[PDB]
């Protein structure tokens, strides 16, 4: 019946358990660094001049 489904759920939880994890500090630093490095090439965050904008 559902016993097999329980086995799959247990195996999936086990596989999800033993995965490498990093501290949230490092992940936040990575996201912040990506935002900082690519900020200038973001037209929405820093609006482009009217000449470059194709939706005048």
């Amino acid at each position: 019946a559902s016993i097999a489904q329980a086995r799959k759920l247990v195996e999936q939880l086990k596989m999800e358990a033993n995965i490498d994890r990093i501290k949230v500090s490092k992940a936040a630093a990575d996201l912040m660094a990506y935002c900082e490095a690519h900020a200038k090439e973001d037209p929405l965050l820093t609006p482009v001049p009217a000449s470059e904008n194709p939706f005048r």
């Binding site: 996201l31 990506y34 935002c35 690519h38 900020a39 090439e41 973001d42 037209p43 929405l44 965050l45």
Partner: peptide, 9 residues
């Protein structure tokens, strides 16, 4: 939900 190009927005 859609991110911006830089992901800040």
């Amino acid at each position: 939900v859609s991110f911006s190009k830089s992901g800040r927005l």
